[PDB]
Amino acid sequence: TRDQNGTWEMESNENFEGWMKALDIDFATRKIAVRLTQTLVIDQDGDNFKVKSTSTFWNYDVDFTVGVEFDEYTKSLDNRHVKALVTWEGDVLVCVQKGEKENRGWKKWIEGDKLYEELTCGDQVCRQVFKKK
Numbered sequence: 114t115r116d117q118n119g120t121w122e123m124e125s126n127e128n129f130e131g132w133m134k135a136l137d138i139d140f141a142t143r144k145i146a147v148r149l150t151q152t153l154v155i156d157q158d159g160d161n162f163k164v165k166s167t168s169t170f171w172n173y174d175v176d177f178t179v180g181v182e183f184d185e186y187t188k189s190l191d192n193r194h195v196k197a198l199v200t201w202e203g204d205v206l207v208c209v210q211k212g213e214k215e216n217r218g219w220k221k222w223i224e225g226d227k228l229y230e231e232l233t234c235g236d237q238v239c240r241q242v243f244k245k246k
């Protein structure tokens with residue numbers, strides 16, 4: 114199941130604060146951001162993806178082509194330069210962001226009408242579940 118198209122509304126969020134701490138996000142931002150429900154909008158056509166992560170506090174958008182490395186500035190998240198690559202491991206979409214932080218990236222996959230996400234950085238893992246709206 115590779116079709117991740119849709120507007121995805123958060124149902125569950127685990128260890129989001131630990132992931133933000135691993136990125137060195139400042140105290141004030143974390144305390145506010147950890148409270149918030151997230152939305153994920155994914156536009157997927159072949160290898161081309163357009164991903165938007167939103168809350169009332171942020172809007173993080175990235176476009177990429179599966180299998181094509183891209184240099185990336187992580188902008189309002191943590192203002193770092195990484196070399197990013199998104200690929201398929203079966204039906205798990207896997208992103209690796211090479212740079213200052215170890216084990217940095219994410220994984221997304223579908224189960225039923227839900228989208229599961231792992232956000233990793235350092236020794237931290239944030240687990241999220243979204244429902245298709």
Ligand SMILES: *C/C=C(\C)c1ccc(N(C)C)s1
Binds near residue numbers: 166175219221
């Ligand atoms: C596929 C998920 C992303 C590209 C995300 C970028 C920032 C996120 N959060 C702050 C939750 S998710």
